[PDB]
Amino acid sequence: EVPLPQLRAYTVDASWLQPMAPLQIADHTWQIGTEDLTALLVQTPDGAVLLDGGMPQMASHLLDNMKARGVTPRDLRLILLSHAHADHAGPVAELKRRTGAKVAANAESAVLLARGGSDDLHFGDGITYPPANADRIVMDGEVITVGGIVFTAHFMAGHTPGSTAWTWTDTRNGKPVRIAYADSLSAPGYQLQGNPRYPHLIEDYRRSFATVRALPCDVLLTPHPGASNWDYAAGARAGAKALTCKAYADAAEQKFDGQLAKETAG
Amino acid sequence: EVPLPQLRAYTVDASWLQPMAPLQIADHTWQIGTEDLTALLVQTPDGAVLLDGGMPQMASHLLDNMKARGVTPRDLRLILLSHAHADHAGPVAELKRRTGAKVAANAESAVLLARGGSDDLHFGDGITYPPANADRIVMDGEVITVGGIVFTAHFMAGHTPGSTAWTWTDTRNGKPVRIAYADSLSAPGYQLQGNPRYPHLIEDYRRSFATVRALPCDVLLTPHPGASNWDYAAGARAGAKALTCKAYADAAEQKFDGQLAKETAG
Amino acid sequence: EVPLPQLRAYTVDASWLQPMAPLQIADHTWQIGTEDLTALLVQTPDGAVLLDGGMPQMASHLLDNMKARGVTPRDLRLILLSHAHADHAGPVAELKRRTGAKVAANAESAVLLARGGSDDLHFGDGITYPPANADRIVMDGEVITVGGIVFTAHFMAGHTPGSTAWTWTDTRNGKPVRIAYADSLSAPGYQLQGNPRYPHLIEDYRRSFATVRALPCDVLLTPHPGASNWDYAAGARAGAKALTCKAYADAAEQKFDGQLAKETAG
Amino acid sequence: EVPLPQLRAYTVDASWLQPMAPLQIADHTWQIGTEDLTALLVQTPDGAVLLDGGMPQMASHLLDNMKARGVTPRDLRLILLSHAHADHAGPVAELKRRTGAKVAANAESAVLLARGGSDDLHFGDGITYPPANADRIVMDGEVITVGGIVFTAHFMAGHTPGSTAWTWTDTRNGKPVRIAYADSLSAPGYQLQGNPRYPHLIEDYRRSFATVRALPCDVLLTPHPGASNWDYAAGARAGAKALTCKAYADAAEQKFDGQLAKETAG
Ligand SMILES: Cc1ccccc1-c1n[nH]c(=S)n1N
Ligand SMILES: Cc1ccccc1-c1n[nH]c(=S)n1N
Ligand SMILES: Cc1ccccc1-c1n[nH]c(=S)n1N
Ligand SMILES: Cc1ccccc1-c1n[nH]c(=S)n1N
Ligand SMILES: Cc1ccccc1-c1n[nH]c(=S)n1N
Ligand SMILES: Cc1ccccc1-c1n[nH]c(=S)n1N
Ligand SMILES: Cc1ccccc1-c1n[nH]c(=S)n1N
Ligand SMILES: Cc1ccccc1-c1n[nH]c(=S)n1N
Ligand SMILES: [Zn+2]
Ligand SMILES: [Zn+2]
Ligand SMILES: [Zn+2]
Ligand SMILES: [Zn+2]
Ligand SMILES: [Zn+2]
Ligand SMILES: [Zn+2]
Ligand SMILES: [Zn+2]
Ligand SMILES: [Zn+2]
């Protein structure tokens, strides 16, 4: 007799789980996640902002890197997200319990986060994580300000309905640097055409390619560094090979077109 | 010495609160709300669907009209919404407690409904109602089926971010009738330009005019009958003067353009 | 023809809405609410705690009093509640939006707060307010610490299922002062016996009288000052006539017994 | 270099996941879960009630057994729970999506269910499952009626704060059978004494032993059949060796006392 299968945890490449010390991107902005998952710490005179947390098991590591940067749990004011999947919003619930952080997200990301990634449009309950509540809902183009640093939401629906690019201007060498943190434009295993759970998926991705193309973008960062050709293990050269937002959008669209063609052929 | 003001309940025109008997729109579809607030009952071989409930005090009236139509509380399967303001989603929480009904809504409508209309983009906490949870989140263009009757969501963001037109095909006289239930395209007291809580408000309304224009639309109904020139008190002539979806969209756009011009002048 | 009634806002005595300047209770502890609604500010080296906010319209007043005390919105860390009715938790949602404050509450209070007081066991939807989410759920006897000040939850179910007394030790004149903030032990218009929504109501109130009787209680404060014979308008004599926790419990039990007898007679 | 550990799914004994055909307990009441996880189907003239669903992967199996019993997804009206851990409430979110079922639970169980078992008092995020919302909150002693069958909640806090025994009277052989579905009285790996997350844990378990002892209890069933000495694989003898509620309470208290002694020694 054959029992129902055991639950299976989603495993990821070791590099996604490999702790790294803080890597400075600009005067206020640091990568504090792992070798292969972005978690951006933005430090202001009025507390700190975290953009993404990576996987659920990264909470303690994030807190240790924050401490190394001089940010105590009380000092973390705000959490923003690229998208509410387990490998980017994984530790958000735990971070909220263990810090002063509140979450701002769009309605789509808030709904997905509140169900801990369950009933995903494409993944079903395959990739779940601890649910968290949003403290503020943002609209497309809306800004949120912490310690005078202004972050602008740019909705880029597709990878998830609530996928968002976040933009802000930091400084380096006395010069402004317009940083764009663009969400994933992957569609891993997705049914793209005629998907009853996402009927306008293709139109949304197309619009999102155009949105990403047009971001204020002196420097592009992505939830997976490899997407934008960052190499967080490469020290002084970490960002040397980084794509422009234009090239990232184009490469993602080319890949998407290929996937659409293969799906039609499939 | 001057105390803080007493809370003020939102009052509405008496007609919005004036009970009426069920008014048949098509073979399966009945208006069961008040003279001036739409609440559509769609009766299927597998239970009933309610589109909108009107104001919070209308729950019992709705249930009485459902009973008159042969729909017991157990038989009400689904609640859909035009938008999650007090004068359309008012009694939803109570209906869920008192019937078998589950709610399907988009993420924006779900978020607003779950906070009972509080922290509204334009109204603040001026117009609140009992919060309710959504049971199913729908995407733009997604269909939901009850007793073989298929309802399609058409997102028409503006009046609220989650404003939705619902379409379905009923029958009359052996002929199909493509019914369009289009949400409000009003912007009552709204700041339209440069609204920090809704930066792309104008672009969303413009897109929504185009969406409404293009709906499958043999018969248009609206949350306020007057918006589409229905007169639910007019018996056999209730729907005679009804606007097409095209004319409704055009009139709403003309009004919107006027409001934009007056705002610029203001 | 007779329309459904207009919604009616709950009105309260003017004194409940009458702003007052901060009134010091102990070295760290201030009354910052109105003449007749308690809102306790506890100021620590690590940010401030608010116990209750009063009615929904009191948010701005609370924030102004906090500013007068040197507590900026960022500095408000924690909100605790006596019970989640409109006249004590009214402004909590707004305070969370406008400050750094997170909410800790028991599961019963959290559920009631999340529905904005709707579907109340006794009031139905008569007394609703903007819903808010809890950030931390506490158990009976659990402590929560802010800036070294330790607050202990004592569950005293009855007035609401989640009614809580909060205790902490402050100082005055170099001496410890064990402060007890005991919730209401009223049952206004309640059906006490055989209430299908609260079958063990009487047993819970009885247990709660015993809990209140036994609190560490050098100084008793209550959500309505009059309950404990505080007079916040009386300056240096505000707390002179204050009841012990023992006397408060006894008077409340005597009143309850009377109500039970009258209900039996009714 | 050493990456953070991969997430680990909780595995269970194969028997907990071993599908079985429906096993009749009384005229209306069937075991439809697995060999070693209880899921009780109660069939009424007005739809069906499910008490527990077992593990997250059991949804489809439950639905298949319901179909075999003549209960279509539309016909499932109500889900009740012993406690909101993954091995009993696992499939509840999915069941709600796939059926007409609404959930009734106490505030503690509702809060835990809504966070999908995350931030557990004892397990932390070790044992999570898809979150679900409750549709009705019940108080201790409150009854809920479906198709004339009356279910009474008896709170028995300890295993979880919201642990509940459910009682109802079915029939067998023309005679009433008072069925008691008592929750777990285990404390697996729990810190019992001086637990900051559950300060009154011991007092709650003691009270719960007394509650279980005193249930109306012609037949005891438990979430794990072995707890009450049921053997669902034993056909006509499945319930022969079943403990009384009195013996179950006593054995659980004896085990608890042993655990307390070992903890003190530890
Ligand atoms: C596809 C996948 C498998 C396991 C864990 C996470 C994911 C995932 N969701 N979104 C992105 S980007 N992923 N890598
Ligand atoms: C005060 C509080 C309640 C719930 C969750 C988190 C917190 C909190 N605020 N600041 C810090 S550090 N916390 N842990
Ligand atoms: C503007 C207003 C006042 C009171 C009650 C409801 C409303 C309202 N919100 N959306 C629409 S359409 N309304 N009439
Ligand atoms: C069973 C149930 C639980 C919570 C809320 C509503 C209901 C319900 N289902 N069918 C009917 S009629 N109900 N009242
Ligand atoms: C009874 C009542 C009427 C209006 C507003 C609030 C209340 C109330 N709930 N709990 C307490 S204490 N109140 N005064
Ligand atoms: C950052 C944030 C997000 C949502 C709600 C409130 C807040 C906040 N934290 N500190 C202050 S002051 N806020 N307004
Ligand atoms: C202890 C444990 C491990 C894995 C899955 C479930 C559980 C559990 N929680 N409550 C009960 S009873 N369990 N068996
Ligand atoms: C209508 C509905 C919406 C959300 C979730 C479930 C359902 C539902 N009701 N009856 C059946 S069968 N459903 N799947
Ligand atoms: Zn993803
Ligand atoms: Zn990813
Ligand atoms: Zn509206
Ligand atoms: Zn309206
Ligand atoms: Zn009250
Ligand atoms: Zn009060
Ligand atoms: Zn358990
Ligand atoms: Zn178990």
User: C102 and A100: CB-CB below 8 Å?
Assistant: yes
For residue A70, the one-letter residue type is G
Experimental technique used?
Answer: X-ray
Question: Which residues contact residue A257 at a Cβ distance below 8 angstroms, ignoring those fewer than 6 apart?
Answer: none
The two most distant CA atoms of chain C are separated, in Å, by 70
Give the residue, out of B127, B159, B255, with the most ligand 3 atoms within 8 A of its beta carbon, to mutate for a pocket test.
B127
For residue A37, the cross-strand partners are none
Ramachandran sector of residue D16 (left: φ over 0; alpha: ψ -120 to 50; beta: rest): alpha
Q: Where are the domains of chain C?
A: 1-266
The residue written with tokens 């209890």 in the block is D217
Please tell me what DSSP assigns to residue C184: P
In chain C, which residues have their Cβ closer than 8 Å to the Cβ of D121? 139
Give the residue, out of D87, D125, D163, D186, with the most ligand 7 atoms within 8 A of its beta carbon, to mutate for a pocket test.
D87
Chain A interface mutation, best of C44, C49, C77, C102, highest count of A Cβ atoms under 10 Å: C102
The two most distant CA atoms of chain B are separated, in Å, by 70
Tally the C-alpha atoms within 13 A of residue B245's C-alpha that lie toward its C-beta: 23
Q: How far apart are CA C119 and CA C128, in angstroms?
A: 9
Residue pair B186/B259 in contact (Cβ under 8 Å)? The answer is no
- Expressed in Å, this structure's resolution amounts to 1.8
Chain C interface mutation, best of B6, B18, B133, highest count of C Cβ atoms under 10 Å: B6
Residue nearest to atom 2 of ligand 6 (CA): A102
Please tell me what DSSP assigns to residue A34: B
Is residue B67 classed as helix, strand or coil in its secondary structure? helix
DSSP H/E element including C105: strand C102-105
Residue nearest to atom 6 of ligand 6 (CA): C97
What's the Cα-to-Cα distance from C251 to each of C158, C186, C213, D239, rounded to whole Å? 15, 11, 11, 53
Give the phi and the psi of residue D255 in degrees, each rounded to 5. -65, -45
CA angle A12, A16, A17 (to 5 degrees): 90
E-strand spans in A32-173?
A: 40-44, 47-51, 76-80, 102-105, 136-137, 143-146, 149-155, 164-172
In chain D, which residues have their Cβ closer than 8 Å to the Cβ of C140? 199-200
E-strand spans in B13-148?
A: 23-24, 29-31, 40-44, 47-51, 76-80, 102-105, 136-137, 143-146
End-to-end Cα distance, chain C:
35
CA distance B8 to chain C (A): 6
A253 lines ligand 1 (CB under 6 A): no
Distance of CA D124 to the CA centre of its chain: 20
Residue nearest to atom 10 of ligand 1 (CA): A85
Which tokens in the block code for residue B239?
């729907």
Residue pair C116/B131 in contact (Cβ under 8 Å)? The answer is yes
Q: Are strands B164-172 and B149-155 parallel, antiparallel or unpaired?
A: antiparallel
String of DSSP letters for B119-156: TBTTTBTSS-------SEE--TT-EEEETTEEEEEEE-
Architecture of the domain made up of C1-266: 4-Layer Sandwich (3.60)
How far, in Å, from the CA of D229 to the mean position of ligand 16?
A: 15
